[PDB]
Amino acid sequence: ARWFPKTLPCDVTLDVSKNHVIVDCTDKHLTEIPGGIPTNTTNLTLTINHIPDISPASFHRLVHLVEIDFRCNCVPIRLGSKSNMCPRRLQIKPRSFSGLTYLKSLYLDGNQLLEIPQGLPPSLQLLSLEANNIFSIRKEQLTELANIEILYLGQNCYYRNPCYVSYSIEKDAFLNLTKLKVLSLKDNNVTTVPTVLPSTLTELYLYNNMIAEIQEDDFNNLNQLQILDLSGNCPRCYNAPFPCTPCKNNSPLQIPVNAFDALTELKVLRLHSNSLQHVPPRWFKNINNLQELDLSQNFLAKEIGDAKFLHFLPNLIQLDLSFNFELQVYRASMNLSQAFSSLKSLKILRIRGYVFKELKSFQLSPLHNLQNLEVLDLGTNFIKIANLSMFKQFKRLKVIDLSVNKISPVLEQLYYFRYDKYARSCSCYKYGQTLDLSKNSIFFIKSSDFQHLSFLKCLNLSGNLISQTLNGSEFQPLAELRYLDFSNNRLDLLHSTAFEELRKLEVLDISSNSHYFQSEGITHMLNFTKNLKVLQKLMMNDNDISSSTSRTMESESLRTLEFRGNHLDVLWRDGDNRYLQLFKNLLKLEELDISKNSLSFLPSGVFDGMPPNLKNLSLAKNGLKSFIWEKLRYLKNLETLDLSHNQLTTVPERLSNCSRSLKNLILKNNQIRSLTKYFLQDAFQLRYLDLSSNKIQMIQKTSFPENVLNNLKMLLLHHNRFLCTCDAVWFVWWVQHTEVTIPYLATDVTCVGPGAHKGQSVISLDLYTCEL
Amino acid sequence: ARWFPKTLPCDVTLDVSKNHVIVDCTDKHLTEIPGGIPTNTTNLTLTINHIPDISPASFHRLVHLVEIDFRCNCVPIRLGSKSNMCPRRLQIKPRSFSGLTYLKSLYLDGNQLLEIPQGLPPSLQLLSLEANNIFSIRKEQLTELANIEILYLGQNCYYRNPCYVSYSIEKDAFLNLTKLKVLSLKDNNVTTVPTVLPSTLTELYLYNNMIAEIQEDDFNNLNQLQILDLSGNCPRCYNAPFPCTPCKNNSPLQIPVNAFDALTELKVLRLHSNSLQHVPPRWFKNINNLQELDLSQNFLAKEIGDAKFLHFLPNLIQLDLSFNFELQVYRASMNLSQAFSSLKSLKILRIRGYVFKELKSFQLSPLHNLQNLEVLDLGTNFIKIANLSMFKQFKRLKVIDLSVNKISPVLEQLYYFRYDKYARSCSCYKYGQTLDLSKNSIFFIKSSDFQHLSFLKCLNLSGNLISQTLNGSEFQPLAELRYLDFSNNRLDLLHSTAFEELRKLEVLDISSNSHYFQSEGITHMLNFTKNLKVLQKLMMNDNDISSSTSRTMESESLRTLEFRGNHLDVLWRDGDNRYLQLFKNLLKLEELDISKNSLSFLPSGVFDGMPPNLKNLSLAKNGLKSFIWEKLRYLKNLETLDLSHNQLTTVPERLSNCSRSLKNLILKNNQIRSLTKYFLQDAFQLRYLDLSSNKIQMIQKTSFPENVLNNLKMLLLHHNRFLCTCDAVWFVWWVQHTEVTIPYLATDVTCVGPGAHKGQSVISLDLYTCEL
Ligand SMILES: *[C@@H]1O[C@H](CO)[C@@H](O[C@@H]2O[C@H](CO)[C@@H](O)[C@H](O)[C@H]2NC(C)=O)[C@H](O)[C@H]1NC(C)=O
Ligand SMILES: *[C@@H]1O[C@H](CO)[C@@H](O[C@@H]2O[C@H](CO)[C@@H](O)[C@H](O)[C@H]2NC(C)=O)[C@H](O)[C@H]1NC(C)=O
Ligand SMILES: *[C@@H]1O[C@H](CO)[C@@H](O[C@@H]2O[C@H](CO)[C@@H](O)[C@H](O)[C@H]2NC(C)=O)[C@H](O)[C@H]1NC(C)=O
Ligand SMILES: CCOCc1nc2c(N)nc3ccccc3c2n1CC(C)(C)O
Ligand SMILES: CCOCc1nc2c(N)nc3ccccc3c2n1CC(C)(C)O
Ligand SMILES: *[C@@H]1O[C@H](CO)[C@@H](O)[C@H](O)[C@H]1NC(C)=O
Ligand SMILES: *[C@@H]1O[C@H](CO)[C@@H](O)[C@H](O)[C@H]1NC(C)=O
Ligand SMILES: *[C@@H]1O[C@H](CO)[C@@H](O)[C@H](O)[C@H]1NC(C)=O
Ligand SMILES: *[C@@H]1O[C@H](CO)[C@@H](O)[C@H](O)[C@H]1NC(C)=O
Ligand SMILES: *[C@@H]1O[C@H](CO)[C@@H](O)[C@H](O)[C@H]1NC(C)=O
Ligand SMILES: *[C@@H]1O[C@H](CO)[C@@H](O)[C@H](O)[C@H]1NC(C)=O
Ligand SMILES: *[C@@H]1O[C@H](CO)[C@@H](O)[C@H](O)[C@H]1NC(C)=O
Ligand SMILES: *[C@@H]1O[C@H](CO)[C@@H](O)[C@H](O)[C@H]1NC(C)=O
Ligand SMILES: *[C@@H]1O[C@H](CO)[C@@H](O)[C@H](O)[C@H]1NC(C)=O
Ligand SMILES: *[C@@H]1O[C@H](CO)[C@@H](O)[C@H](O)[C@H]1NC(C)=O
Ligand SMILES: *[C@@H]1O[C@H](CO)[C@@H](O)[C@H](O)[C@H]1NC(C)=O
Ligand SMILES: *[C@@H]1O[C@H](CO)[C@@H](O)[C@H](O)[C@H]1NC(C)=O
């Protein structure tokens, strides 16, 4: 019990080690900077509110600020919400920041500013002005930034935030910023590389602009540069998901053979979507240290068969040559130059979108002696034919990616095609060697398909066309396999011996194999688990399972079963007792997800039929309208119960008399109108309680004893129907004074009434008239 | 417009032609019979309420009743709701019905009654007592029913409603019911056919019981019998979705060879799930008239190859032999006896679940000269091989059904396996010859697959594995095809010539082909419609479409496009204008469904890009948060606008000023809190307005002018947040007195407040204190 309730609508955190006082008002529907921000505040975040102006009054007392993050209070129209459009650009009055003598970082992105704010203090190292309307950079406006190290100025002139002219940078605008390390002028309608830049630069971002030519002297003095990105100048526009204008005459970005001669420290060079047709070896004459080269989205199909430049790249770790195919050509095979065999240090090679019919072992020979190679990505190639046995020569790899091909007998889903993959907003690999054949056209498998692949630890066959009864013979070579992803196929579980040859299998995913489960009368052996002696996790979600020939699933090893998106309602049809012990003999089961099974009620017998060590149970999203809480007594190890998104109207009379073990109880999104008188009495093991999005009007102390409440890690109460009368005096006082974490106090823990108090936050509620 | 507002919570309808006054109180959450039921009431329905008793008071004034339907006021526990269980059986006091001199039909199903109710009037023709607890029938209890024609007594003793003993029927119980035509004793735990039954019977239902044997004289005197159902006596229990006990020693229902000799009028004989191994021809010696025979779910696999009995069935119209397979046998081929060729009158033949590998032309030769044959169903057979050309000999058929097989180069989904398909609760065929290959394993198609099939009007390929670029060559022989269902495949629309060879195609479904639309960078030609010159309807739902190589779809014929479940939000990304005319050149488009496209706002240009004759537009389920109503002015022929299930908060100031053509406006399930002052002023075209499930508090007269309300066919206002204060005087009076059709007045047009009035129906609201 606090003496001084916190009324500030911001989260406040103390890191006493670094003398930091962190005040986070992100997304609090503020129209002004709140009063009462601590005087010792060092980090203030006001991102995503609607504060229309800054003034000397804004940060007057806050002389210790090292960081102000004031992003996105007035976002450009095409980037922002159309339902609450910002009426007018952010107004910054003079002298708003000059008193902030300690200020090291100022983020003003996304405020529709017209100029670089002046009057900035000389302590400043980082200034961020992305997604404003600043499209002319003048030396005079940069004087104030003598000590600046990091300067983000991109996204001020592009299709989502147009300025309708070419960007302008004055000659030498940046040269006297003698500490400047990082400069980003991406997405800006820039026409030439600005010169001369300070020789202190380590990173220069010039991507997504209109630079048609690099001058031979553009990067001459940049002997500390580590990252250079020039991508998206003369873009390759085929199937671009954004408005795309190529350089005329089908020209590439014109880079002189000596343009990079000064860049002795360069580790990263990105030349994505520059419409390049050749890669001159001479580019790399004085760069020995290069680690990452991106040449995706050019027209380098022919060059890949020649590629003399690779002889200059013995320290390269990553090479990307994806999407270099020649339009309207479907090549017979892949032609990799012998020069690839020079890439001594290569760990990652990506060649998506080369677009060819047949992959053959001899085509990968240039890679045979790359000892460090960990990832080979040949996805999205429309490969029809590939003998998988070729990968016996690639046992050292971590991931072989043939995803999205047409074979028959982790990068973001948008990655190569998106406009700016580093734009800022307001998995089985860890098991060992992985062969990813997801999203192919495999319709039938047999043992011989996997000959010589016994070293594989993860096989991903998700999203193939496999419509086959498995009998234990199809995967015989895969003696080491620990993870099989068989999701999104048409498994037919006619035989209980399915998968038994995978003797080291720990995780099996057969989710989204609903096809044979959808048609009446068909045999399904759900007892196939018995044979899998180290199986830890089974996923069988979204299989629409409503019938089973076997009555029990069996396993001595299984710990986790996901059974979401089935029809246990039909299996457990009231009057039919036959499947009430379906999961009972999964003796080591700790986690069971039976959400989304249309269970509007639970027949008696379900809880008695649960296996004895069940710890985490989800019954979410079932339309459940009633629930006999007493039956939780059968679940002696139960720690997490998820009943979210149902239609429950009551809680147990005594949660302690239903379950002694329960730590996490999730009742969000139900129809609960009141709590029982002694609901939480003596529930000392309770740690997490979600009652949000219900219809609760009143809570009294008997239901919510203080010796239970003060031990919760989290208590969620938001989006209820609290009635703020004199009867609510205890709850209101308790909420205002507690240290228990209750999220959304500042925003969605609100009185609905009476009258005067409607829409008011309970945190701000003054009930003195109740005590007169 | 009314002087006497209707307060009765039942719908009341007049059919003056048959002198009927129909009062329907179905599902009105009634706990008593309401007062004020009209004295002239002829049909009274009180089904699905919680009225706990009937007495002389119940129907006292209602002397003209011809029908009382009082079903399901206390349903058996396993059949009923578990959230509102019925506490005690319905109580009927003496003399409750004897005054109802005209009563012809009494339904008392599903009330947990213990006996046949006595004191019934002699006018009664139909009595229904299904799903009660009456399991002993005595002659004495039936004397009141001298005039009874129809008697339903089933579902009184079975697994969903157990009685724990065998059913008992006294000897000759029914014999003196000399007008009895229809008797149903299904689902009753009956052990013998009751005898002697009255010779006036036309239909006898004895299915789902424990009859082990028919005696030779059980049906001797039933010379008027038309329908006999003995199914589910000695059931075939393999994969039964209900608890199933077979007769011992695998015995069939034992039927003597002469058991049916008296049944000269018999038209329908159902012997489903009787575990039959033979069908003696002698059964049918004296039945010439038989039209329908069901022999599904027996063990007749061998008999189908012999089938001498078919020689006695020259008038049979329908024959069902589905699910006769031998357990654990997968036959090479199907062996139909030559005797099938004697089925001169046959229209429908179903043989699902025979379970065989290969279908060959010669196997169907016994059917070649059945001239009347219209439907051939060989679904659910696990057929792997079938030359589709064989169906050139079957051009006279209406439907050829090979659904749910494994072929590679309309009955309810539960039908053959369900317990009782006639249990009572409380498509392209019309285009002509149909070949249904849905739910097969076809992975690649070519022209020659359809050789000799040019007569087909509808082809169903839904749910195959077709992952192929189509180029206009794959369907060349299908010259007459009007409907292609290509849904649930993996169409790759690389070429705009896809489907062009289907020159007569009127409807194309390519819904749920999302696979190639889900991976970035892939080419997709949505302009493939240009070539299809009679195409009327295109469905491309749930394709996840977020990119297109072509900018415009084109067609001179298309009238209906379904484009639901895509990502128009990504295609029309704010700042990208390229796809704003995607639909503009569908010049004859009248119907466009762009629901479920994540459209949280509509970019400007969308409405100007719509084609000119658009009449019906759905933007439902988009998360729409704002809407510029004025843009509706571009849609000059707009008649239906569906904006349901969005997050709109306001209506236009003047709908008339946004659209002159709009007739139907659907705003249900939005967040509207108030209407604009003059919302409907001069909206003379408006005919239908749905404002249900919003948050409206008050409506005043200005918003709703009488000269618009007078032309409304329907105005939906239920599930709002009406505040019943003195400011609501107009709305409350208007609702009570209007003739405009407003559904759910009895149930869901309710005050939320203030206090006293909470949960009260507005129809019942008395505001006299406002006028004092
Ligand atoms: C508070 O503000 C300071 C100043 O911007 C932040 O300091 C940065 O912290 C990380 C450590 O995780 C470093 O790698 C950066 O280089 C630091 N920058 C400077 C300029 O000191 C600090 O992280 C902020 N803390 C918050 C918001 O919690
Ligand atoms: C990028 O700069 C160009 C000019 O280099 C802008 O193009 C001009 O736009 C105006 C108004 O749209 C036209 O009337 C001029 O004719 C254009 N000039 C040229 C030379 O193209 C372009 O809009 C700028 N891009 C962005 C996104 O703001
Ligand atoms: C159908 O009738 C049989 C009796 O013919 C019922 O089975 C008996 O049930 C009692 C109580 O469960 C048992 O003690 C007897 O052993 C059973 N007898 C036999 C012969 O099986 C059965 O309960 C009835 N079915 C239903 C659905 O009520
Ligand atoms: C009407 C079918 O009844 C059971 C059944 N289930 C399957 C099944 N899940 N898959 C099958 C695959 C090939 C052949 C037969 C079957 C099969 N069958 C047929 C059977 C002979 C029993 O295997
Ligand atoms: C990275 C791929 O970009 C374009 C494309 N789209 C498809 C497509 N939808 N399907 C294909 C099928 C076979 C071979 C090539 C393609 C193909 N291709 C390759 C192309 C050469 C244009 O045909
Ligand atoms: C591979 O590519 C190079 C292009 O420089 C070409 O000279 C060579 O003939 C090609 N080999 C094959 C097998 O196509
Ligand atoms: C696949 O490659 C292996 C050699 O690693 C060989 O045994 C096998 O015969 C090849 N398969 C086919 C189908 O050519
Ligand atoms: C397998 O590939 C699919 C589809 O590409 C992906 O979503 C899935 O997570 C992968 N599976 C595993 C286990 O990594
Ligand atoms: C499993 O199927 C394969 C053919 O795909 C066959 O070789 C084998 O005999 C089958 N195994 C058993 C145990 O029946
Ligand atoms: C699985 O299902 C049933 C018993 O419930 C039986 O037909 C089959 O032999 C069983 N197989 C295993 C591995 O338990
Ligand atoms: C009214 O009851 C009579 C007699 O049962 C019946 O024939 C008629 O269909 C009923 N009408 C309606 C509308 O339910
Ligand atoms: C098919 O079936 C019957 C078995 O009932 C057998 O007598 C007959 O010879 C078989 N005929 C053919 C053509 O296989
Ligand atoms: C299918 O049968 C037809 C005769 O109707 C014949 O032309 C064709 O050869 C058969 N096709 C195949 C692939 O066997
Ligand atoms: C085609 O078959 C599927 C069932 O497999 C069914 O859902 C669909 O409605 C049928 N299509 C048509 C046009 O009848
Ligand atoms: C279309 O595809 C078929 C078979 O794949 C082939 O016969 C034909 O060459 C193709 N037509 C065109 C115009 O490419
Ligand atoms: C479809 O789209 C592209 C232009 O994006 C064009 O090449 C192609 O010929 C068009 N086809 C038709 C049938 O209009
Ligand atoms: C909307 O109302 C104004 C004022 O009456 C009128 O001038 C304007 O033309 C109207 N527009 C339409 C489309 O009716």
TrEMBL record, chains A, B:
One of its GO terms (cellular component) is early phagosome. It is found in: Endomembrane system; Endosome. One of its GO terms (biological process) is innate immune response. Its main location: membrane. Glycans are attached at N40, N43, N189, N335, N387, N460, N471, N527, N616, N657. One of its GO terms (molecular function) is metal ion binding. Disulfide bonds join C10-C25, C72-C426, C74-C86, C157-C163, C234-C247, C237-C244, C428-C458, C724-C751, C726-C770. This is Toll-like receptor 7. Guanosine binds at F382, K406, D492, T523. Coiled coil: none annotated.
